[PDB]
Structure 1
Amino acid sequence: LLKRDPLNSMMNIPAVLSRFAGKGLLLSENGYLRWYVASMSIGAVVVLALLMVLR
C-alpha cells in the first residue's frame, strides 16, 4: 500500500496546485487589447471600491 509513497504525493499537492493556478492565470493573457483595457478598468473599480470601503 505504501510503495507509491503517499506522503510524497501529499507534499506534491502544492506543486500541482501551482501548475493548475498558473494555467488558469494564463487565460487572462489572450492577447486582446480591448480585454486589457477592460481589465484595467476592472482593476480601477476594484481598487476604488476597496479604498472607499476601507476609508
Structure 2
Amino acid sequence: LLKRDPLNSMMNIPAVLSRFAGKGLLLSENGYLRWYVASMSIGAVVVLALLMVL
C-alpha cells in the first residue's frame, strides 16, 4: 500500500498547486491591450476600495 509514496505525494502537492496556480494566472496574459487597461482599472478600483475600507 505504501510503495507509491504517500508522504512524498502529500509533500509535492505544493508543486501541483503552484503549477495549477501558474497555469490559471497565465490566462491573464492573453496579449489584449484592452484587457490590460481593464486590469489597470480593476486594480485601481481594488486599491481605492481597500484604502477607503481602512
Same fold (TM over 0.5): yes
- What TM-score do the two structures reach when normalised by structure 2? 0.98
Following TM superposition, by how much is the alpha carbon of 1:15 offset from its aligned partner in structure 2, in angstroms? 0.3
The C-alpha deviation readout for 1:3-53, integer Å capped at 9, x for no partner, is 011000000110000000000000000000000000000000000010000
- Give me the CA root mean square deviation: 0.3
Aligned length: 54
Unaligned runs of 5+ residues in structure 1 are: none
- What TM-score do the two structures reach when normalised by structure 1? 0.96
Kindly indicate which of the two structures has a greater share of residues assigned to helix: 2
Unaligned runs of 5+ residues in structure 2 are: none
* Secondary structure, aligned partner of 1:23: helix
Determine the C-alpha separation between the residues in 2 that align with 1:16 and 1:5: 16
